[PDB]
């Protein structure tokens, strides 16, 4: 069983070391908090939160970094190496990369203005990476609501609250133009924009992402508070201003009978959202972890110990 007090004796200052690292990085890169939270999400959705995503290529297995959901998208790996080194110095061979990334995700949310809580700990590190599983398990922005629900259920999160609350991670961070081009100019081969996208916002997004333009150009997920972790993400959905298809479907999909009330509830109360986010985050952080003597305490998050 994972427990929040796992390192209270072996490495009491682990959380503080992680926090300090993120604080320093944020000065030069205000996007790092969002990036780190996303890394934890992509870790947990593939064989569980086992730091499998942090592993680099080997001649026996490919890195998840080349998955369709990670390539030229996932970022912040050097920052993780930095805090890991700092933690190894303070507490040699004690904190697993999987736990480190979980704490980093929680601290990132808090630093961005979100809720503060102690995450369950005790996870251990994987002995391999899973590229095929990542391509199969990571959801895509073009998924319909039923597909989004299927993706979450596939990894163990059955609750619509899990999906709606965790999608709140899009209250900050960046998104490439490439992922919304269809919504802007030709959605579902209709030759028309996605009707669920607010027409005023459509104009703005088209100006940021012109047809035949730079597909790698970045746009803010939350037009209200781009770098602050708050419930504004849901207020946007209510006004048809969710950035990607998967965002707006939580409120506009024909299958959203169960998610609409959750979206409204989170838009109406920050407390309601924050409570749900912590609950969902801990549930996601509890997906098939390696514990006890299973796996290892990786010294270099990029490679399995030898």
Residues within the annotated binding site for Ca(2+)?
A: 43, 46, 48, 50, 52, 64, 171, 222, 225, 230
Cα(170)–Cα(300) distance, rounded to whole angstroms?
A: 30
Using CB under 6 A as the binding rule, whether residue 149 contacts ligand HEM is answered as no
Cα(123)–Cα(170) distance, rounded to whole angstroms?
A: 26
Nearer residue to Ca ion within complex by CB, 47 or 108:
47
Q: Catalytic annotation on 42?
A: yes
Helices and strands counted in the chain (H then E): 13, 2
Nearer residue to Ca ion within complex by CB, 179 or 273:
273
Per-residue binding letters, 212-251, with ligand HEM (x by CB under 6 A): --------------------------------x-x-----
Cα(98)–Cα(217) distance, rounded to whole angstroms?
A: 31
Q: Is 3 exposed, middle or buried (0-12, 13-18, 19+ CB in 10 A)?
A: exposed
For 150-218, give the DSSP string: HHHHHTT---HHHHHHHGGGGGSSEEEGGGTHHHHH-GGGSSS--TTS-HHHHHHHHHHS-TTS-TT-E
Among positions 61-90, residues that touch ligand HEM (CB under 6 A) are: 73, 75
H or E element, residue 85: helix 77-90
The option from ligand HEM, Ca ion, none interacting with 63 (CB < 5 to 8 A, set by class) reads none
Using CB under 5 A as the binding rule, whether residue 270 contacts Ca ion is answered as no
Using CB under 6 A as the binding rule, whether residue 131 contacts ligand HEM is answered as no
Question: Which residue is closest to ligand HEM by CB?
Answer: 173
The option from ligand HEM, Ca ion, none interacting with 198 (CB < 5 to 8 A, set by class) reads none
- Picking from 282, 244, 240, the residue whose alpha carbon sits closest to that of residue 263 is 240
Per-residue binding letters, 229-268, with Ca ion (x by CB under 5 A): -x-x------------------------------------
Q: Find the shortest distance in angstroms from Cβ 25 to ligand HEM.
A: 12
- Picking from 293, 291, 296, the residue whose alpha carbon sits closest to that of residue 127 is 296
Please select the residue that binds ligand HEM; options are 6, 130, 179, 234, rule is CB under 6 A. 179
Cα(98)–Cα(290) distance, rounded to whole angstroms?
A: 9
Nearer residue to ligand HEM within complex by CB, 11 or 243:
243
Among positions 7-46, residues that touch ligand HEM (CB under 6 A) are: 31, 34-35, 37-38, 41
Residues annotated within a binding site for substrate: 139
Nearer residue to ligand HEM within complex by CB, 75 or 159:
75
Retrieve residue 300's tokens. 């270099």
Residue owning tokens 């996303």: 38
Residues near 144 by Cβ (< 8 Å), separated by ≥ 6? 249, 253, 255
- Phi then psi for 128, rounded to 5 degrees? -165, 170
Interface residues toward Ca ion, by CB under 5 A: 43, 46-47, 50, 52, 171, 222, 225, 228, 230, 232
Where does this chain bind ligand HEM (CB under 6 A)? Answer: 31, 34-35, 37-38, 41, 73, 75, 139-141, 143, 148, 166-167, 169-170, 173-176, 179, 244, 246
Q: Catalytic site residues?
A: 42
């Amino acid at each position: 069983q994972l427990t929040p007090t796992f390192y209270d004796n072996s490495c009491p200052n682990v959380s503080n070391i992680v926090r300090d690292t993120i604080v320093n990085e944020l000065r030069s890169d205000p996007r790092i908090a969002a990036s780190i939270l996303r890394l934890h999400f992509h870790d947990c959705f593939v064989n569980g939160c086992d730091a499998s995503i942090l592993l680099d290529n080997t001649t026996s297995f490919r890195t998840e970094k080349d998955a369709f959901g990670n390539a030229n998208s996932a970022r912040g790996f050097p920052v993780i190496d930095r805090m890991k080194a700092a933690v190894e110095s303070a507490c040699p061979r004690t904190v697993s990369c999987a736990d480190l990334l979980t704490i980093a995700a929680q601290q990132s949310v808090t630093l961005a203005g979100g809720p503060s809580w102690r995450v369950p700990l005790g996870r251990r590190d994987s002995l391999q990476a899973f590229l095929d599983l990542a391509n199969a398990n990571l959801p895509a922005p073009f998924f319909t609501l039923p597909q989004l629900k299927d993706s979450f259920r596939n990894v163990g999160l059955n609750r619509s609250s899990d999906l709606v609350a965790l999608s709140g991670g899009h209250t900050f961070g960046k998104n490439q133009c490439r992922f919304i081009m269809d919504r802007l100019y030709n959605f579902s081969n209709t030759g028309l924009p996605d009707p669920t996208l607010n027409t005023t916002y459509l104009q703005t997004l088209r100006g940021l992402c012109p047809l035949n333009g730079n597909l790698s150009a970045l746009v803010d997920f939350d037009l209200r508070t781009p770098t602050i972790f708050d419930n504004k993400y849901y207020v946007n959905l209510e006004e048809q201003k969710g950035l990607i298809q998967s965002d707006q479907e939580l409120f506009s999909s024909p299958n959203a009978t169960d998610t609409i009330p959750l979206v409204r509830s989170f838009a109406n109360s920050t407390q309601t959202f924050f409570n749900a986010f912590v609950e969902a985050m801990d549930r996601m952080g509890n997906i098939t972890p390696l514990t006890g003597t299973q796996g290892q305490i990786r010294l270099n998050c990029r490679v399995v110990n030898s």
